[PDB]
Design an enzyme around this catalytic site. Structure first.
Site, PDB file in Angstrom:
ATOM      1  N   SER A  35      37.649  63.134  24.600  1.00 21.98           N
ATOM      2  CA  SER A  35      36.321  62.590  24.980  1.00 21.98           C
ATOM      3  C   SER A  35      36.259  61.123  24.693  1.00 21.98           C
ATOM      4  O   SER A  35      36.786  60.719  23.678  1.00 21.98           O
ATOM      5  CB  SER A  35      35.251  63.277  24.093  1.00 21.98           C
ATOM      6  N   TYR A  67      29.350  66.856  17.595  1.00 24.18           N
ATOM      7  CA  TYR A  67      30.236  67.098  18.752  1.00 24.18           C
ATOM      8  C   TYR A  67      31.296  65.997  18.805  1.00 24.18           C
ATOM      9  O   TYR A  67      32.486  66.307  18.892  1.00 24.18           O
ATOM     10  CB  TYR A  67      29.488  67.160  20.135  1.00 24.18           C
ATOM     11  N   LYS A  74      35.581  66.012  18.086  1.00 22.90           N
ATOM     12  CA  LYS A  74      36.598  65.595  19.036  1.00 22.90           C
ATOM     13  C   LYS A  74      37.583  64.627  18.377  1.00 22.90           C
ATOM     14  O   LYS A  74      38.815  64.732  18.585  1.00 22.90           O
ATOM     15  CB  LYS A  74      35.972  64.993  20.295  1.00 22.90           C
TER      16      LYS A  74
HETATM   17  N1  LIG Z   1      32.322  63.230  27.443  1.00 20.76           N
HETATM   18  C1  LIG Z   1      33.074  64.258  27.044  1.00 20.76           C
HETATM   19  O1  LIG Z   1      33.435  64.319  25.857  1.00 20.76           O
HETATM   20  C2  LIG Z   1      33.457  65.373  27.936  1.00 20.76           C
HETATM   21  C3  LIG Z   1      32.399  65.940  28.851  1.00 20.76           C
HETATM   22  C4  LIG Z   1      32.706  67.323  29.293  1.00 20.76           C
HETATM   23  C5  LIG Z   1      33.715  68.062  28.825  1.00 20.76           C
HETATM   24  N2  LIG Z   1      34.567  67.658  27.767  1.00 20.76           N
HETATM   25  C6  LIG Z   1      35.553  68.594  27.198  1.00 20.76           C
HETATM   26  O2  LIG Z   1      36.129  69.349  28.210  1.00 20.76           O
HETATM   27  C7  LIG Z   1      36.389  70.692  27.777  1.00 20.76           C
HETATM   28  C8  LIG Z   1      35.911  71.628  28.875  1.00 20.76           C
HETATM   29  O3  LIG Z   1      34.538  71.339  29.047  1.00 20.76           O
HETATM   30  P1  LIG Z   1      33.726  71.888  30.263  1.00 20.76           P
HETATM   31  O4  LIG Z   1      32.850  70.816  30.761  1.00 20.76           O
HETATM   32  O5  LIG Z   1      34.559  72.494  31.346  1.00 20.76           O
HETATM   33  O6  LIG Z   1      32.672  72.975  29.607  1.00 20.76           O
HETATM   34  P2  LIG Z   1      32.625  74.543  29.815  1.00 20.76           P
HETATM   35  O7  LIG Z   1      31.665  75.168  28.828  1.00 20.76           O
HETATM   36  O8  LIG Z   1      32.360  74.902  31.276  1.00 20.76           O
HETATM   37  O9  LIG Z   1      34.140  75.020  29.559  1.00 20.76           O
HETATM   38  C9  LIG Z   1      34.533  75.445  28.226  1.00 20.76           C
HETATM   39  C10 LIG Z   1      34.991  76.894  28.331  1.00 20.76           C
HETATM   40  O10 LIG Z   1      35.524  77.321  27.039  1.00 20.76           O
HETATM   41  C11 LIG Z   1      35.052  78.591  26.747  1.00 20.76           C
HETATM   42  N3  LIG Z   1      35.035  78.680  25.304  1.00 20.76           N
HETATM   43  C12 LIG Z   1      34.173  78.092  24.413  1.00 20.76           C
HETATM   44  N4  LIG Z   1      34.514  78.308  23.140  1.00 20.76           N
HETATM   45  C13 LIG Z   1      35.640  79.129  23.233  1.00 20.76           C
HETATM   46  C14 LIG Z   1      36.423  79.728  22.226  1.00 20.76           C
HETATM   47  N5  LIG Z   1      36.188  79.597  20.895  1.00 20.76           N
HETATM   48  N6  LIG Z   1      37.421  80.540  22.676  1.00 20.76           N
HETATM   49  C15 LIG Z   1      37.625  80.662  24.033  1.00 20.76           C
HETATM   50  N7  LIG Z   1      36.943  80.180  25.031  1.00 20.76           N
HETATM   51  C16 LIG Z   1      35.960  79.387  24.554  1.00 20.76           C
HETATM   52  C17 LIG Z   1      33.683  78.728  27.407  1.00 20.76           C
HETATM   53  O11 LIG Z   1      33.448  80.141  27.677  1.00 20.76           O
HETATM   54  C18 LIG Z   1      33.888  77.900  28.703  1.00 20.76           C
HETATM   55  O12 LIG Z   1      34.390  78.661  29.798  1.00 20.76           O
HETATM   56  C19 LIG Z   1      35.793  70.805  26.351  1.00 20.76           C
HETATM   57  O13 LIG Z   1      36.838  70.580  25.413  1.00 20.76           O
HETATM   58  C20 LIG Z   1      34.797  69.623  26.394  1.00 20.76           C
HETATM   59  O14 LIG Z   1      34.504  69.079  25.097  1.00 20.76           O
HETATM   60  C21 LIG Z   1      34.363  66.390  27.305  1.00 20.76           C
END
Ligand SMILES: NC(=O)c1ccc[n+]([C@@H]2O[C@H](COP(=O)([O-])OP(=O)(O)OC[C@H]3O[C@@H](n4cnc5c(N)ncnc54)[C@H](O)[C@@H]3O)[C@@H](O)[C@H]2O)c1
Ligand SMILES: NC(=O)c1ccc[n+]([C@@H]2O[C@H](COP(=O)([O-])OP(=O)(O)OC[C@H]3O[C@@H](n4cnc5c(N)ncnc54)[C@H](O)[C@@H]3O)[C@@H](O)[C@H]2O)c1
Ligand SMILES: CC(=O)N[C@H]1[C@@H](OP(=O)(O)OP(=O)(O)OC[C@H]2O[C@@H](n3ccc(=O)[nH]c3=O)[C@H](O)[C@@H]2O)O[C@H](CO)[C@@H](O)[C@@H]1O
Ligand SMILES: CC(=O)N[C@H]1[C@@H](OP(=O)(O)OP(=O)(O)OC[C@H]2O[C@@H](n3ccc(=O)[nH]c3=O)[C@H](O)[C@@H]2O)O[C@H](CO)[C@@H](O)[C@@H]1O
Ligand code: NA
Ligand code: NA
Ligand code: NA
Ligand code: NA
Lengths: 338, 338
Positions: B124, B149, B153
């Protein structure tokens, strides 16, 4: 109060436990014995004048933590359990992050579940990272620690801080300090490190006792009075006391209470060696080596805040630190029995 | 390659999976379904043109992770699993530290046990903390994130970094980015947030679709061309692609590879609203509100390094981001079926 002391059989923890018992609290020790022996237990009880309950287990086992807290109706927790070898942490980072960071997390998650909201964290002055401004004050922002060990300590502080913000009724102390040395004045408790001692004092101690040939001194060309590095050493009894006072006075006072625990002054390598030659009755052997990379010439903590707010200050001297150490070695040359 | 994609059913993960399958890799999706639905699976397979294996479970279950890695003979892991709501993280810090920090730790501990040494971390840009120097470059030191959060990260990045140092044969990418937006061009996959959307785009989208009355714009007095905040938005397809390229080119190349993924430019709030009014065919409703505390007037990432080293750059536009979003809403007004 009813106190759970994690890591209660370790070095700092054992001394703390004795003081707690002396003050009449009800003590529950939780230790996994990875770096301590069951043989200290009876010493603790005897010096404390009261029986502490012992539970062998791991902070990482959230279920067991919850059970314990409940069973013993804990009011507050003093957390010493974790790994603390800086060099080993660079070699085995994951173990450090699991024991320290995950270990604390599991522990505070169990507290939440059991409704316990008083916590005393045995932190580290490593959190100030590379601050060139000395002495270090609680008002200074934290820096970036250099080893996985240092980093784990700062991570836990931050985690606890966010937790308190989200659960404002909690009282959490972050106790920061440098080098704990010394031993219970009885000479029947002390540091029992296995293998090569990383910390100066223990090392000096082992050379004096004849277990090691000579102490290597890292640099003799620093901008300090005698050219050797200047550090911060605190007697383990003073440290134990600070932990007890903090637990007693901060209980049920919501907030994140940060305190440095130390003498408020620095001592050089030579100063420490000379104190020791003095205590053991013979000149400690040593030679000079080059500077250790990343070393500051001098570093120590400002302990004014603790004096002011907790009315706490050290009462043991450097010589006493040396004497009490030698005293424990002399009485228990093989450490704690197996 | 044989790839385990944690969080594979989520937003970014789903799109990534499709691209992986299109490139012919063998994909294993591990998801606990806390923030996604099994109904995306069949879409993934259909758009990818190949079947991915699905395993419902949690990254925190080290045992299951080990089993999986072994069973499927995984070569590399792309890690998207975790929690990412900034406001909720301030309210529920422990869940964030457990899912993110402990979750990653358990996951890499299983990899070590199974002998897997290729990792792609979905990081992130929050890691840069409050850097006033923009655009942000990989060469800038990290700062202190403001929410639990953000902090989680940065903690994972540091943990991974120390791990690589201790186990030098590992290849670990730290992929940093800001705001993923948009949807698969088919309009059959997209972001399906439950409850109030925190991110600007999704919010705008919900107002346009009629689910919300008006967008509140935080300040109109910034030192930017139109007075509104300037941010960084990246099309989810470009982001998915960057993750795929990184996985392919970095596999078996030891080191910690840090890359910012973004367009290399910023867009204002009004710019984004206008793009959207454009895509949906009607003026999006909005009003101004006061500045949101801690907001910079402008912020974006420099993506030169990725262009140079991975030969990767974005290929989708802001308008496309708006169009593809509206397209998915239009086709699947109720999101993924239950
Ligand atoms: N600016 C930022 O920092 C930026 C913005 C968005 C996403 N991200 C990162 O991208 C990644 C994916 O994000 P996303 O937008 O697709 O969100 P999202 O919630 O759609 O995807 C995350 C997935 O992980 C699953 N999950 C959550 N905790 C879990 C666990 N303990 N075990 C197994 N599955 C688990 C959820 O069911 C979900 O399907 C994350 O690591 C998120 O922090 C960062
Ligand atoms: N400069 C510094 O940072 C400074 C120096 C020393 C100690 N400390 C901190 O003080 C605390 C106590 O240190 P110490 O010097 O007494 O060391 P120690 O090893 O004697 O005490 C720690 C005790 O915790 C136990 N333990 C370890 N991991 C455990 C786990 N997962 N579950 C349960 N028990 C576990 C060990 O068996 C040991 O008895 C630690 O938190 C340490 O980091 C900091
Ligand atoms: C062993 C250990 O955990 N060291 C940590 C301790 O350093 P810290 O310097 O506080 O304590 P040490 O016990 O490591 O060293 C004390 C002093 O003695 C010197 N010395 C030490 C041992 C020896 O064999 N010879 C010698 O000359 C050191 O250069 C220093 O000037 O806290 C710091 C964080 O604030 C970390 O950077 C250190 O890695
Ligand atoms: C929702 C979210 O996770 N925000 C995080 C995102 O901020 P970031 O600013 O990148 O993204 P957001 O989606 O939160 O906001 C985008 C822009 O739109 C504005 N805006 C947003 C929503 C809205 O209803 N109205 C409005 O005017 C914001 O002031 C900003 O100028 O990454 C930052 C780290 O780099 C964090 O500090 C933020 O907390
Ligand atoms: Na709150
Ligand atoms: Na022994
Ligand atoms: Na090593
Ligand atoms: Na739905």
């Amino acid at each position: 109060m009813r106190v759970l002391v994690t890591g209660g059989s370790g070095y700092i923890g054992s001394h703390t436990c004795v003081q707690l018992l002396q003050n009449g609290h009800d003590v529950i020790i939780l230790d996994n014995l990875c770096n301590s022996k069951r043989s200290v237990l009876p010493v603790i009880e005897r010096l404390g004048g009261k029986h502490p309950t012992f539970v062998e287990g791991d902070i990482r086992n959230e279920a067991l933590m919850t059970e314990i807290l409940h069973d013993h109706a804990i009011d507050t927790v003093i957390h010493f359990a974790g790994l603390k070898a800086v060099g080993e942490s660079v070699q085995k980072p994951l173990e450090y992050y699991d024991n320290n960071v995950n270990g604390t997390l599991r522990l505070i998650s169990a507290m939440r579940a059991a409704n316990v909201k008083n916590f005393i964290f045995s932190s580290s002055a490593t959190v100030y990272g590379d601050n060139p401004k000395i002495p270090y004050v609680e008002s200074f922002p934290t820096g970036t620690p250099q080893s996985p060990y240092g980093k784990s300590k700062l991570m836990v502080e931050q985690i606890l801080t966010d937790l308190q913000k989200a659960q404002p009724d909690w009282s959490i102390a972050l106790l920061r300090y440098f080098n704990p040395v010394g031993a219970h004045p009885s000479g029947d408790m002390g540091e029992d490190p296995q293998g090569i001692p990383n910390n100066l004092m223990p090392y000096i101690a082992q050379v004096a006792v004849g277990r090691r040939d000579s102490l290597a001194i890292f640099g003799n060309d620093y901008p300090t009075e005698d050219g050797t590095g200047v550090r911060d050493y605190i007697h383990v009894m003073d440290l134990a006391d600070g932990h007890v006072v903090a637990m007693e006075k901060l209980a049920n006072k919501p907030g994140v209470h940060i305190y440095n625990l130390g003498a408020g002054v620095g001592n050089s390598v030579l100063d420490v060696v000379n104190a020791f030659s003095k205590a053991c009755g013979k000149p400690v052997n040593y030679h000079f080596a080059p500077r250790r990379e990343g070393d500051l010439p001098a570093c120590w903590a400002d302990a004014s805040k603790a004096d002011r707010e907790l009315n706490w200050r050290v009462t043991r001297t450097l010589d006493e630190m040396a004497q009490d150490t030698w005293h424990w070695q002399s009485r228990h040359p093989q450490g704690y029995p197996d």
